[PDB]
Structures are given as structure tokens and as C-alpha cells.
Amino acid sequence: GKGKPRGLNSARKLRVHRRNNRWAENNYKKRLLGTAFKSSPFGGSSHA
Amino acid sequence: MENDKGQLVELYVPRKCSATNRIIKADDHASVQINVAKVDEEGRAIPGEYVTYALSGYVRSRGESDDSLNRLAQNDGLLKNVWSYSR
Amino acid sequence: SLPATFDLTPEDAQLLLAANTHLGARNVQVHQEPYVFNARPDGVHVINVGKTWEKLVLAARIIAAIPNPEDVVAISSRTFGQRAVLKFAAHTGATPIAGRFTPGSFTNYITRSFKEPRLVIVTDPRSDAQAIKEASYVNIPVIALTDLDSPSEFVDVAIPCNNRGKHSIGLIWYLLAREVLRLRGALVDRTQPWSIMPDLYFYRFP
Amino acid sequence: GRVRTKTVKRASKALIERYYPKLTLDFQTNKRLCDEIATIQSKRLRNKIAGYTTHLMKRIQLQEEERERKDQYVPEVSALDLSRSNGVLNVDNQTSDLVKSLGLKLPLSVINVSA
Amino acid sequence: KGWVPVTKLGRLVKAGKITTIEEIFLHSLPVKEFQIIDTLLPGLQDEVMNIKPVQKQTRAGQRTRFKAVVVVGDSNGHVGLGIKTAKEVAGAIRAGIIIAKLSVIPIRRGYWGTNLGQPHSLATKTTGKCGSVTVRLIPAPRGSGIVASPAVKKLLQLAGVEDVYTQSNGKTRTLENTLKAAFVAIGNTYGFLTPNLWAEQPLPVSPLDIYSDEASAQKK
Amino acid sequence: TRSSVLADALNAINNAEKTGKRQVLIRPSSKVIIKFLQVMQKHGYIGEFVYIDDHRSGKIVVQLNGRLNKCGVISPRFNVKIGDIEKWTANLLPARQFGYVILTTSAGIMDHEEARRKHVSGKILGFVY
RNA sequence: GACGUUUUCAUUAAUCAAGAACGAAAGUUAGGGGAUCGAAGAUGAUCAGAUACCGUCGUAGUCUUAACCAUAAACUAUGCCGACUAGGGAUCGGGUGGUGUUUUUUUAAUGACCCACUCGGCACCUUACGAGAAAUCAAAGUCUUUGGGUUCUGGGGGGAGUAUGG
């Protein structure tokens, strides 16, 4: 069954499933917490 | 298989298995071509006119190599009750 | 197919039943019931020997078709038929092989013991272990003999007999060789004996 | 203890194989034979050939006749018949059902431990 | 010279009984010695992929082996791949031509959605695999050229193709596995039962029945 | 549990054909599977088959000629528009000029090109060759 | 639990957020004995770190009673219900008796057997068709020829199962 639901009502799971596994990706968590804005002394710039 | 006007494509028009009805490729290192010359009255050979068999690779590898050729000798007119149709 | 020249006859069944090949092998990996009929009441299998005769009927169709008698090869690592192949050879025209099968015989086209066969008849396809394994590279048919524990792998002509007693092997060797020489053509029938004995192809005790 | 000249042991395969009794144990007359015929161009190193192949005479004191052999010799009254068992044989009860069920003519004697 | 003919197939070819190349493929023949396909087809050319200096220790101080990977072929549907570690640069170069003449087999390549004067692309999506590398070829429209890695493109030139859409996967940067995998991938286009290959073959004769008196095993 | 009998169909014929048989005994079976196999016989990827019956589920015996390489259910049984069947072609079919996904629809059961011919498109069932 | 049944329900079903039982060893409160050894410890060691392995007594503990805990290499390192294939001589739990062989119910009774046959548990090894990177695996298969159903985890190494909070 390859560890996942498939049936055509289960999308409720799946877009909540990947929603909790994007945080294991690195630049996703780097991006969507404003860590480039709370740190990185350019402050998201390109020069200073 | 054929172009805008016909003209069949891709030389080495291959030959086929007669046991699993699969194909025999020019790679293959198990496929055997069998020339069964006939018999007749006086019962010798008639060498040259052949019941040509071909045996591919999966049958010869995975017990079922032998009984699959009993059927072909039966159902062509070569042997009698060596292959139980009522198996 | 089966001509009026030859089919099942009870005068060559003199020979096979005189060898007692109702003594087959005693336990059967299950690929080996087109040719058994029953077993004696302690469980040793009885052979449909008329179909074992049809085996040699098509086995000679295989042999006599080739316009090259040099292309006939017979292997015998089991000691019993090691005479028999020579007993075949100068009779038939097959090049004889007996003893140890040299590892990489059908491999290594450079070395001395490299044969170019078009047809190979084996004798004991367990004792001819790397003659079963390493022969199906250059696309060769495997004329074999098959007791009830003998390989259904890599074979196509499973001739049922025993290999316990020197008479069975040379017996079926002689029963094929007689009509191979008669497919090449000397004599006719089956109740008719050949000029030389079925005793001829058998094993001495030196 | 010693291994002298090694091109000697073909003495029992070159000269002896047609001419057996040539050599002699005493050595006062057996050494003229090796000067005329060969490229042996010495006087002292020459006669080392007898003693290294004298020791080969201590084991003693063509197979193509075995393919036409194989159609002549035969015991004419042998066990390759229905004769020494007098035809009737101890045969299985279902082999009698086999010569039934194929069509064959035999004598069928049956021994049994029960069924 | 000539061929000094061995293995009953040089005995065919040195006289001249087999004319074409695919005649040998037609019967699924064995090939043991190697210059047969170059006699049968002079159009091939030696196209080196890589000659890399491996210094594996030969037990007393390494004397500079070389593993060459040579893809021989004409760009007309006759390929060949040879891999050999040898003791010389030019020795490994010639050794890579030896094995690449043993390893010859063509590719059934066709059209894609129509037909016109000459075929361009493959017949079917195939895939070969060598341990670490998967190679997944795809049929292509007219003209679009070889979409492949810089090693794969020259081998598929010698396949005779003008257009492929390769979609390989795996640890491709071991370039020894990759061409083995892609050679499996091109060695399957005949070995795939497609609905155009649905006819019943008659199983015709072998020429090793025919020629066997004409120019065969000679004792003399 | 045999949640899809249509799935514990042809997987059985995978385990027959890949293991090299000429038939298999399918039990249970439905009119889903019966018309599925009538469609497959109409295409002739598989050969002749027979429904034998009990006062239970029922059995099917198939006599093909090899050309069934692979089939499979595409569960869950997705619902497809007209233009979107051709999406499902190029994902999981060998070439353009053969090969059939088949469909259950309110016009019964037929492959996706008879859907293109008789001008509907419905729920997926499987891919067959 | 298995097995037999031409007994009864006629879909009562699979897993599983939440929720609930149980739980080695060790450990945790209040008691019984207190025989056995014995993490700590109190002693003798005993010569440099041939190396500190030795030895002797040992509170609690080991054993239990009214209760926790909720931890393992809790590992067959493989969640649970499906499908088929190998190929085998035995096993054990059941079912059967060969003009079937003997002590003796009286040739095959109590029991047990050769030859066969069935479903339950524990296993083994073959060629590996299929895999895997590989050791190996009859399932770690039927997955690039990618979809029988369902649940929990992983995203380079560390920092770190650390801080913080519930």
C-alpha cells in the first residue's frame, strides 16, 4: 500500500501530510520564518 | 513498421518463441533452433525438410523446460501420448 | 510421423524390461510426470517405456538431419557409458568425449579442448554438471536422460531410465544407435536384431 | 645427491623403443656409438648418457587396435537374453498392468510381502 | 591473413557465405572472434569516450594501467561498447576496440505519430539499468536532437538516431555504469513485445544447416 | 480482505504470467471483472475465457497467447474529463500508436479511445497490455 | 489455538487520530521471610601502568503481598489484514484406514508403523524468475512495465534528542 492513503476522499490527509513534511526541507523553514530578516546582517539585501 | 508509401523498417526481422510465445533476441544465449527431419515409409530421415522448433531462455531456466516441448511434438504429428493432453 | 517401419514393439521391450527399469528413482521433484505409470508398492516408479521408445524415435530425427556427422558430440563423465560413447563413435561418426569436463571447454576458443558442436548428447546430467551449466551459452540442444531426481532444468529430451547398473545406460545408447545407423540406413525392423550385440556397449570390470 | 645432464632421459624413448637389448653394464666397449651421428663435439662430457638412463632399467626386467576391437569379441551364450532366469521374472503387479496398459507379451511372476 | 578461419563462422565468412550483418543476428548466432563485423561493415569508426590512467598496485610498484571505454560504430544502426583495463595507452585503445566488436547489436528505431521517407526516433519507451544507473529512453518528434548527457549523445549517434528524449536517473557520474545501463536500454527495442510485433513467425531455417558442406570444418 | 476483487484479479494473472502460466483461477469475480475481461478479449490482449459458476462468487478461466505483459488497476478510481484522458495516456503507456487505459463510465466499460469515439470520458479502471 | 461438522448471525468487517489494558531487567512506597549470592561499600590486596584482572564480608536487591514505572540490541534490527509461486524430507495439533507388516483383542489391536492425504505451528536449504548498491532476502517479491486497503516515522553530518515550552 506504499505507506500512504490513496482513496478519493483522503486529500484532507495529504495536503495536511505534506504540510508537516515541508518543514523537514531546509530552505522552506529558513524562508517562512523570516530568518533572513531576523538575522543575516545584509537583512535580505544584496549589498551594503 | 512502414513509411509514407510502405517500405518496411528495421532489418533483423526477428523470430519468436513457440513455447511461451515470447520473442527470441539476437542477444540470447539459451534459444535453441531444432531441425526435426521427418519420417515416411522406409522410416529413415528425409534430411532437409524440418519441423523447426525454437526454445527461449525463461523456459530453460525456471523445471518447466522439458514438458513444454512434449506438447509441440504431440500437437504437430511427431509423437503419440508422450504429452498427456489430459494432464 | 510414427512410421509403419517402427513404433512400440515387444521385441525391443525384451531389452528394456530385461534391464528392470521399473526401478526408477525414489523421490520426485514435481516436474516429472509425463512418463511414469505407477510405482511398485514400496514406492519405486514404473516407466512408460513405449514413450521412452518414442523419445529415441524423435532423438534420431534430431541426429540424422545434420549434413555434418562430425557435428555430433556425446559426453559421458559417468564411468558406465564411458565405453559406450566410443562404442557409438566409430559406429556413428560422433566425436567422443569422456572423463573430466575441462572447466571452460565451450568457453575459451583459444585453448586446445574447444569444441564446435551442433548437437550434444549427454549421459548423466548431474555428473555432467558443468556440461549442463556451461554448455547453454553457445545455444546447444541438450539430449539428456532423466531418472526421477535428474534435472528438468536446461534439458528438452528427458529420457526416463535408471543409472544404477551398467546395462541401462548402454542399453538405451544401443537402442538409439541402432536406428541412427538405420536412419543413415542399413537395416529395417525392430524384432529384427542388428548384426552386433546389445552386449557390445556395456561396461567391463577390469 | 646429484642431478647430472638432463637431455638424457629420452634414451628410453628414442633409441630403446626400436632396439631393446643394446646397453651393457660394463663400460670398457660401449662408448664409440656417440661420436659419428650427433653434434656431440667432445671427449669427456660425452659419455654421461649411459649412467643417468641405466637407472631406468629397474622398472622393467598404440591404442588404435581398440576401435576395430569393438565389433569382434562376444560371449555368444551370455546373460543378454531371456535365458539365465529362464524367461519368467519376478515382475511388479502393476508392471503386469503396464504390459496390459501398453500392449506387451511377457511372463509375469509376482513376489509379495503383503500388498 | 584472410582470416585463418576459426569457430565455423570465420569458415563461413572467409569464403563469403554470409553477406550482410543482420543475417548473423537473424539466427541469434554466437560471435567468438571479433573482426567479423568490421569485415561485414567497413563503415564503423573508432570513437573513444575515455582513457583514464588507473594506477592499481601490481604488487611491487604500479606500472600504470589504463581502462579505456571505446564506443565503436557507424551512425547507421550498428553499435559497440568495449571496456578494458590494460598495460598500455594504445594497448587499452586497441583492447577497447576488441570488446566493442564483440558487443554489436542494432536498435529497432522507428517513427512517432506519422510516417515519411526515413525513420527518426525509437519505437517504445525502454529502460536499462546497471547497478547504480537507470537509463529511460523516450521516443521523440522530428528534428529535436539528442537530449542526453555528453557521454550518451555520441553512443546514440552510432545508434543511428536523430532524436531521443533520455530521462536517466541514478548515480550517473560513475561513467562506467552509465554506458552499460544505456547499452542495456538500447539493447531492448527488439526485446519488447509490442503490438506491431504481433505476427506469427514461421521459424525458418538456420544457415548452419545450409552451408555445412560448402565451406565448413576442413581437416585436409 | 479483497477490497478490490478487480485488484486481486490480474495481480493473480501477473503471478500467473510472470511466473509463466496459461491460465489462473479467479475467485471472487464480478460483472465488473466479467465485462473487464470481455473488453480485454475484444481487444485480444488476452485470449478466450470462460465464466464457470457456483452458488457463491464464481470462477474465470483464461486461455491467452502470451500478449498480456502487464495490467494493473489504477485505484483510486479517478474521474477524468475528455481532454484529461490523454494526460493519462502519456504518463503510463508504452507508445502513442497502441496501448489502452480502459474506463468505466455511464456508457458502461470501454477503452479511452472508444471514449474518444463515442464522446464521453469517465472513471478510470486500469491499464492493459 | 488447531481440527471435524449439510448447526446459528447474514456483512455483524480491516487497520487505526483521540481513548484504554498490559509490561522484562532495573528503579519507585507500605509489609513477610531474611536461605542464596551480591551494583555500592568496609577490608586484605599487591608490585611502578608483566596488568590491575584478585580475594573476602556485604546494607538494600534477588523471592513474594496491596500498587506503580512504562525503559531495551522490547531485535526475526522487517506495522497489520490480501495473491501466487516454489521444492523438499521431517516435525507437531487434528482427521483416515490399504486381500498393509509384527508383541497380541484376534494378519493391519493399547500404541506404533511403510505407502498416501488434509488443514495448524516451528524451521530449514536449493536454483534466485524478482529484487537490493551489497551482505543477503520464497519475501527485504508481483515498483521507471511505478496505484490490493490502512497507521506511524526520515530529509547531509553534526550542534542535539540539546535548549525551550506543553
Curated annotation (Swiss-Prot), chain A:
GO terms for molecular function: structural constituent of ribosome. The stereochemistry of the 3,4-dihydroxyproline has not yet been determined. GO terms for biological process: maintenance of translational fidelity; maturation of SSU-rRNA from tricistronic rRNA transcript (SSU-rRNA, 5.8S rRNA, LSU-rRNA); regulation of translational fidelity; translation. It is found in: Cytoplasm. Its main location: cytoplasm. Keywords: Cytoplasm, Hydroxylation, Isopeptide bond, Ribonucleoprotein, Ribosomal protein, Ubl conjugation. The keyword Ribonucleoprotein applies. The keyword Ribonucleoprotein applies. Disulfide bonds: none annotated. It comes from the Eukaryota. GO terms for cellular component: cytosol; cytosolic small ribosomal subunit; ribosome. Component of the ribosome, a large ribonucleoprotein complex responsible for the synthesis of proteins in the cell. The small ribosomal subunit (SSU) binds messenger RNAs (mRNAs) and translates the encoded message by selecting cognate aminoacyl-transfer RNA (tRNA) molecules. The large subunit (LSU) contains the ribosomal catalytic site termed the peptidyl transferase center (PTC), which catalyzes the formation of peptide bonds, thereby polymerizing the amino acids delivered by tRNAs into a polypeptide chain. Belongs to the universal ribosomal protein uS12 family. Present with 10600 molecules/cell in log phase SD medium. This is Small ribosomal subunit protein uS12A. It comes from Saccharomyces cerevisiae (strain ATCC 204508 / S288c) (Baker's yeast). The gene is RPS23A. The chain holds residues 2 to 49 of 145 of the full protein.
From Swiss-Prot, chain D:
It comes from Saccharomyces cerevisiae (strain ATCC 204508 / S288c) (Baker's yeast). It is found in: Cytoplasm. GO terms for biological process: cytoplasmic translation; ribosomal small subunit assembly. Signal peptide: none annotated. InterPro entries: Ribosomal_eS17, Ribosomal_eS17_CS, Ribosomal_eS17_sf. GO terms for molecular function: structural constituent of ribosome. Component of the ribosome, a large ribonucleoprotein complex responsible for the synthesis of proteins in the cell. The small ribosomal subunit (SSU) binds messenger RNAs (mRNAs) and translates the encoded message by selecting cognate aminoacyl-transfer RNA (tRNA) molecules. The large subunit (LSU) contains the ribosomal catalytic site termed the peptidyl transferase center (PTC), which catalyzes the formation of peptide bonds, thereby polymerizing the amino acids delivered by tRNAs into a polypeptide chain. Component of the small ribosomal subunit (SSU). Mature yeast ribosomes consist of a small (40S) and a large (60S) subunit. The 40S small subunit contains 1 molecule of ribosomal RNA (18S rRNA) and 33 different proteins (encoded by 57 genes). The large 60S subunit contains 3 rRNA molecules (25S, 5.8S and 5S rRNA) and 46 different proteins (encoded by 81 genes). Keywords: Cytoplasm, Ribonucleoprotein, Ribosomal protein. The gene is RPS17A. Its main location: cytoplasm. Disulfide bonds: none annotated. GO terms for cellular component: cytosol; cytosolic small ribosomal subunit. The keyword Cytoplasm applies. NCBIfam families: PRK01151.1. It comes from the Eukaryota.
UniProtKB/Swiss-Prot annotation, chain E:
Pfam families: Ribosomal_S5, Ribosomal_S5_C. Residues 44-107 form the S5 DRBM domain. N-terminally acetylated by acetyltransferase NatA. Disulfide bonds: none annotated. Keywords: Acetylation, Cytoplasm, Isopeptide bond, Methylation, Nucleus, Ribonucleoprotein, Ribosomal protein, Ribosome biogenesis, rRNA processing, Ubl conjugation. The keyword Amino-acid biosynthesis does not apply. InterPro entries: Ribosomal_Su5_D2-typ_SF, Ribosomal_uS5, Ribosomal_uS5_C, Ribosomal_uS5_euk/arc, Ribosomal_uS5_N, Ribosomal_uS5_N_CS, Ribsml_uS5_D2-typ_fold_subgr. Transmembrane segments: none annotated. SUPFAM superfamilies: dsRNA-binding domain-like, Ribosomal protein S5 domain 2-like. The keyword Ribonucleoprotein applies. It comes from the Eukaryota. There is a cross-link at K1 (Glycyl lysine isopeptide (Lys-Gly) (interchain with G-Cter in ubiquitin)). One of its GO terms (cellular component) is cytosolic small ribosomal subunit. GO terms for molecular function: small ribosomal subunit rRNA binding; structural constituent of ribosome. GO terms for biological process: cytoplasmic translation; positive regulation of translational fidelity; ribosomal subunit export from nucleus; rRNA processing; translation. It is found in: Cytoplasm; Nucleus, Nucleolus. Belongs to the universal ribosomal protein uS5 family. NCBIfam families: uS5_euk_arch. This is Small ribosomal subunit protein uS5. It comes from Saccharomyces cerevisiae (strain ATCC 204508 / S288c) (Baker's yeast).
UniProtKB/Swiss-Prot annotation, chain F:
GO terms for biological process: cytoplasmic translation. SUPFAM superfamilies: Ribosomal protein S8 (SSF56047). It comes from the Eukaryota. The keyword Zinc does not apply. Keywords: Cytoplasm, Ribonucleoprotein, Ribosomal protein. Pfam families: Ribosomal_S8. Its main location: cytoplasm. Component of the ribosome, a large ribonucleoprotein complex responsible for the synthesis of proteins in the cell. The small ribosomal subunit (SSU) binds messenger RNAs (mRNAs) and translates the encoded message by selecting cognate aminoacyl-transfer RNA (tRNA) molecules. The large subunit (LSU) contains the ribosomal catalytic site termed the peptidyl transferase center (PTC), which catalyzes the formation of peptide bonds, thereby polymerizing the amino acids delivered by tRNAs into a polypeptide chain. Present with 40400 molecules/cell in log phase SD medium. There are 2 genes for uS8 in yeast. NCBIfam families: PRK04034.1 (NF003115). Belongs to the universal ribosomal protein uS8 family. Component of the small ribosomal subunit (SSU). Mature yeast ribosomes consist of a small (40S) and a large (60S) subunit. The 40S small subunit contains 1 molecule of ribosomal RNA (18S rRNA) and 33 different proteins (encoded by 57 genes). The large 60S subunit contains 3 rRNA molecules (25S, 5.8S and 5S rRNA) and 46 different proteins (encoded by 81 genes). This is Small ribosomal subunit protein uS8A. The gene is RPS22A.
